Structures are given as structure tokens and as C-alpha cells.
């Protein structure tokens, strides 16, 4: 809602203007991989287990492949936020020399 | 270019903080209307 | 997602997001401060056809 | 010259949720982001740190289509932000009174809860600035060029 | 010299300034000598020319 | 080293070929520092 | 021949992480495991 | 800023006394502290992670 000041002729008489808007949201997305391998499934599955202590130790080598790859992905989104602000604010910002 | 909905104005979400000449930069917006005072297609 | 190759199994997580730029007028500034090294050798490379 | 940063653009809306304040409680109006060496050069000579630790909220905003908004997403295909309160107050404006300045919708919401956050603070001109370099917290030891 | 692309460019300075704050360059830095850009890469480079 | 900590934070052929112009100029100028510009103070304290 | 079960309980901890494949020839046995390899078990 | 700094007195010791001595002779290689490296390879099998 723009404001006004009254003037004297020969200036033309000005009237209260109004300004009205629509903005369309732009949309972006994210990506993160996680990959296991072939034999890491069977230790979580149980196809390559025994009654030994060695096999039941080997699941702890397979569960800690996930936990070292869970936190390297769920933490990898908060550093995409801090990435995907500085890829927008380098697009809305024109330089001080202009 | 859709004509937006005038009753969303009638209870606004959040208020601005600074008035500017608005038709200097237009293409930041899409449906832009310079309303010389209270006019036809506001109703 | 769940989409496998080469024996391995990929879990390609996705998350879609949105950007409303709620600024009537300018809200952000680039300030070009310093000059690091030029990439191009300012040299002679004649162009052919 | 740094004043010409803090005056060349004009501020957008007042969201009364954020409250990125000081220990004193003064609200911050802008945020600079620089690299690592230019942060050090501006702290030795040109500018002076005011405060070390700033109060930042924790929660986020739920904007959920539960309720009577759910029907207009299915039958119809669009959704108002808060139809339970845009639609509620379209029965009293026609009937009761008039105002030029209303109650803004966000000013009736809850106040979030804040903790204490270590982040350096800079006062250029007459308004505060979060100043922060971002190649140690983020972009540390990855394959990613710093933008 | 390409008279088509300037005719496709507009006149309003309030976006011409911002579009040359993050313009799409015609060159790539990882090239050997100097190449036209491959269609996948987009370096955000500002152009006062 | 200061042109190697400014390279271990990004890897192709040109990014190598600009380090050679860095390891030359950073050596021909700022090798012996306490002898050349030791009269100043801000240059030493940095 | 890196013995995998030795660091399942570590003895000390590093502080700073780097792209380690920058400097390789300091070392004797070093491997780039892309989030899991088959030979990890 | 200061003249008089606080410094430790003694070194560290790593001795093959204990259960590691059997691995020194019959096995002929050595864990650092098998009394505690090998011990905590059991509670992770049993209880927690």
C-alpha cells in the first residue's frame, strides 16, 4: 500500500496505488547412497552362520558396517542444507558493483 | 498466470516491513496488478 | 529407494524441498573481495578453422 | 564499505518466531558468510566482536493437512495454509467490526524454546551480523568444491 | 556476434543484473586447452562482458 | 605448503598446472621472511 | 594385511580428518573402501 | 604469557608381563593389551553396541 503526498498544479493529481502479487515455489531435491555388498546381506540374513563364536562375531562386523554408514548419511543432510542455502543465495544476490 | 484469491488478503499470514516502488522489478512476481485506486476487478 | 547392481545393493535416499523467496525487493548481496590466481595462461593460442 | 553491505538491501518480513538474539537479547537483522582468511582479516583490525554466544531456537514448524483441510486436498485439489482459521474469521469480519491493522496470524502462535549456541557476532553500522566461515564445519575433507 | 541470443535477452535491468551475477559460462576449467561446455556441467560465473 | 593447503580442500589436470605457478611465486618471494621484510610488524605477526 | 578385529576396540583416537588419498606413499597397506567391500569380512 | 609450565614426571610402560607372554612365545606376535583388547571382544558379543 503505497503512501501519498498532495501537490499543486501543473503537477497531475496522484491517486493511491495498490500492488498485488503471486509467487510460484521452486522445488529441489537431495540424494545419498548407502551401498552394501554381496556378503554383507548374508551375515544380516543368516545364510552363512554356524554355531561357532566366529560367525556370531562376524555379525558384529556386519552390524557395524551399517552404523558407520547410517551416521555418514543421516548426518549428510544437514550439510546439504548448509549447501543448498549457498546455492540459492548465490543466485538471488547481484554484486555490489551493480 | 492465475488470478489469485483476494480473501487470502482478508486475513493475512505475515506482514511486510518495508514499502518500495514495486513495479520497478516485476519478474520476481507473476500476477502483478497496478491498481490505481480502488478499481474494477478487485470485486 | 532400493536398486541393485554388480552384486551390491544401493539405498539411494531422496528428499524433495522448496524455496519461497519472501522478499519484496532485494534481500541478498555478493561482495567480490579478493582475486586468487588466474586459471588461464594469458598467452597466444591462435584459433583455426 | 561494510555499511554499504548492510544498507543496500531492504529487510523482508517480520517472523516473530526466529528470535536469533544475544545474551542481552537484541535481535539480529542480517548474516554475513565469508571464507576462512577474510574472516581472520576482519577480526584482527577492521571490526570488533561484541558477544560470543547467541540464543537460537530448536524446534521447527509443523504444517500438516489434518482436519477440515484434508477434504479440499482430495475432492478439490488445492490447500489453504490454515483453512481452519482463514475460514473461521470469514464470519466475524462481515458482521462485527472493521480494522485497518489486524492481528497478524503468526503473532498468535507459540514461542519456541531456545538453547545457547557458540557463534561469533559482529556489529556493522547499527545492526548485528552473524559472521561465520564455512569450510571447517561443512566442506571439510570431502570431494566437494566450496561454492 | 550471435544476434539471436541478444534478441532473446530482455531489457529490464532488475533481472539483467542478477542473471549476470550467476550466469552460465561458455567455458570449462577442467578442459585441456579450452572447450565449449559439455551439456552436463554448469559453472555459476558472473559476466561483466 | 600454503599453496598445498589451498589445494587439499576441493583434482583434474589444470588444478595441478596452476600449482606450479604457485610453488614458483610463493618460493621466489616469501621464502626468507625474517630477513626481507622484518622491519614491519603486521607482516610478521601474520 | 590390516587385521580388522584389532580396531573393533580402538586404543586411541585421531582428531583431524583429511582426504587421505592425497598423500598415499607414506604408507604400506591402504585401501579405499567405498562404503563396504566384499573383502571386509 | 607465562614462565613456569606444568610437565609430567614419568614415561609410559608397555610390558609383556601377563597373558601376552604366551602369545610372545607360542604364537610369536603380540596384541598391545590383550587383557583389555581381547576382553572387550566379548561384551559386544553379549550385551551392547
Q: How would DSSP label each residue in A29-82?
A: EEEE-----SHHHHHHHTTT--SSHHHHHHHHHHHHHHHHHHTTTSSTTHHHHT
Q: Do C and B count as touching (3 or more CB pairs closer than 8 A)?
A: yes
D60 vs F: CB within 8 A: no
Q: Which residue has the cell 554356524?
A: A50
Radius of gyration of chain F (CA): 13
Does residue D83 have a cis peptide bond before it, meaning omega lies within 30 degrees of 0?
no
CA dist., res. D124 & res. E36, Å (int): 43
CA dist., res. F29 & res. F44, Å (int): 15
CA dist., res. G41 & res. B40, Å (int): 77
E strand spans, chain D: 30-34, 53-57, 114-118, 121-124, 127-133
Q: How far is CA D13 from the centre of its chain?
A: 9
CA dist., res. A65 & res. C10, Å (int): 14
Q: Which residue has the cell 550439510?
A: A79
Q: At a CB cut-off of 8 Å and minimum separation 6, what does A45 contact?
A: none
Q: How far are the Cα atoms of C48, D8, D74, E33 from residue C32, in angstroms, in the given order?
A: 35, 15, 49, 27
Set of cell numbers at residue D60:
521447527
Q: At a CB cut-off of 8 Å and minimum separation 6, what does F24 contact?
A: none
Q: How far is CA G13 from the centre of its chain?
A: 13
Q: How far is CA D25 from the centre of its chain?
A: 15
CA dist., res. F43 & res. F46, Å (int): 5
Q: Do G and H count as touching (3 or more CB pairs closer than 8 A)?
A: yes
CA dist., res. E2 & res. A69, Å (int): 51
Paired strand residues for B34 = A19
For residue B25, the distance in angstroms to the closest alpha carbon of chain D comes to: 14
Q: Specify burial of residue A37 (Cβ count, 10 A radius: 0-12, 13-18, 19+).
A: buried
Q: Specify burial of residue A57 (Cβ count, 10 A radius: 0-12, 13-18, 19+).
A: middle
Q: List subunits contacting chain E, requiring 3 or more Cβ pairs under 8 Å.
A: A, B, C, F
Set of cell numbers at residue F41:
610488524
Q: At a CB cut-off of 8 Å and minimum separation 6, what does D6 contact?
A: D30, D124, D125, D127, D129
- A window 59-98, beta carbon within 8 A of E: 90-95, 98
Paired strand residues for A31 = C14
For residue A6, the distance in angstroms to the closest alpha carbon of chain C comes to: 26
Resolution of the coordinates, Å: 4.2
Q: At a CB cut-off of 8 Å and minimum separation 6, what does F13 contact?
A: E30, E32
Residues of chain C neighbouring A29 (CB-CB closer than 8 A): 14-17
For A85, the 3-state DSSP assignment is coil
The neighbour count for residue D54, using CB atoms within 10 Å, is 19
CB E20 within 8 A of CB E44: no
A21 vs B: CB within 8 A: yes
Set of cell numbers at residue D41:
582479516
Paired strand residues for A28 = C17
E14 vs B: CB within 8 A: yes
Paired strand residues for D118 = D53
Alpha helices in chain C (DSSP H): none
Set of cell numbers at residue A77:
543432510
E strand spans, H1-49: none
For A96, the 3-state DSSP assignment is coil
CA dist., res. D127 & res. B37, Å (int): 37
The neighbour count for residue D32, using CB atoms within 10 Å, is 19
G15 vs F: CB within 8 A: no
CA dist., res. E39 & res. E18, Å (int): 23
Amino acid at each position: 500500500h503505497q503512501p501519498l503526498i498532495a501537490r499543486d498544479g501543473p503537477h497531475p493529481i496522484e491517486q493511491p496505488t495498490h500492488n498485488y502479487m503471486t509467487k510460484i515455489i521452486d522445488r529441489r531435491a537431495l540424494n545419498a547412497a548407502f551401498s552394501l555388498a554381496t556378503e554383507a546381506i548374508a551375515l544380516l540374513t543368516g545364510e552363512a552362520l554356524d554355531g561357532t563364536g566366529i560367525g556370531a562375531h562376524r555379525q558384529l562386523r556386519a552390524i557395524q558396517q551399517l552404523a558407520r554408514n547410517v551416521q555418514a548419511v543421516l548426518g549428510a543432510f544437514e550439510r546439504g542444507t548448509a549447501d543448498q542455502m549457498l546455492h540459492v543465495l548465490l543466485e538471488k544476490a547481484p554484486p555490489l558493483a551493480l | 498466470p492465475p488470478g489469485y484469491r483476494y480473501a487470502a488478503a482478508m486475513v493475512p499470514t505475515g506482514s511486510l516491513l518495508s514499502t518500495i516502488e514495486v513495479a520497478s522489478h516485476r519478474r520476481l512476481f507473476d500476477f502483478f496488478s497496478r491498481v490505481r485506486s480502488d478499481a474494477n476487478s478487485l470485486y | 529407494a532400493r536398486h541393485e547392481t554388480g552384486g551390491g545393493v544401493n539405498f539411494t535416499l531422496t528428499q524433495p524441498r522448496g524455496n519461497v523467496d519472501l522478499g519484496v525487493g532485494y534481500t541478498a548481496v555478493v561482495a567480490t573481495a579478493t582475486v586468487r590466481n588466474p586459471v588461464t595462461d594469458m598467452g597466444n593460442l591462435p584459433q583455426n578453422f | 564499505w561494510l555499511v554499504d553491505l548492510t544498507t543496500a538491501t531492504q529487510p523482508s518480513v517480520a517472523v516473530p518466531r526466529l528470535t536469533h538474539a544475544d545474551t542481552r537479547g537484541r535481535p539480529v537483522d542480517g548474516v554475513l558468510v565469508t571464507t576462512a582468511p577474510i574472516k581472520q582479516r576482519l577480526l584482527q583490525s577492521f571490526l570488533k566482536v561484541e558477544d560470543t554466544e547467541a540464543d537460537v531456537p530448536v524446534t521447527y514448524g509443523e504444517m500438516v493437512l489434518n482436519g477440515a483441510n484434508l477434504v479440499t486436498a482430495l475432492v478439490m485439489g488445492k490447500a489453504v495454509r490454515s483453512l481452519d482459521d482463514v475460514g473461521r474469521h470469514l464470519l466475524e469480519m462481515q458482521e462485527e467490526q472493521l480494522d485497518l491493522n489486524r492481528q497478524t496470524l503468526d503473532e498468535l502462535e507459540s514461542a519456541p524454546q531456545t538453547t545457547r549456541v557458540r557463534a561469533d557476532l559482529v556489529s556493522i553500522g547499527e545492526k548485528l551480523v552473524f559472521l561465520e566461515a564455512l569450510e571447517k564445519r561443512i566442506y571439510a575433507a570431502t570431494n566437494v568444491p566450496y561454492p | 556476434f550471435t544476434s539471436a541470443d541478444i534478441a532473446a535477452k530482455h531489457r529490464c535491468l532488475e533481472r539483467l543484473i542478477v542473471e549476470t551475477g550467476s550466469a552460465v559460462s561458455t567455458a570449462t576449467a577442467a578442459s585441456d586447452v579450452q572447450f565449449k561446455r559439455p551439456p552436463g556441467c554448469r559453472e555459476l560465473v558472473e559476466d561483466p562482458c | 605448503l600454503l599453496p598445498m593447503q589451498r589445494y587439499l580442500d576441493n583434482a583434474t589436470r589444470v588444478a595441478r598446472a596452476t600449482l606450479v605457478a604457485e610453488l614458483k611465486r610463493s618460493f621466489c618471494e616469501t621464502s626468507f621472511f625474517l630477513g626481507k621484510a622484518g622491519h614491519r610488524r603486521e607482516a610478521v605477526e601474520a
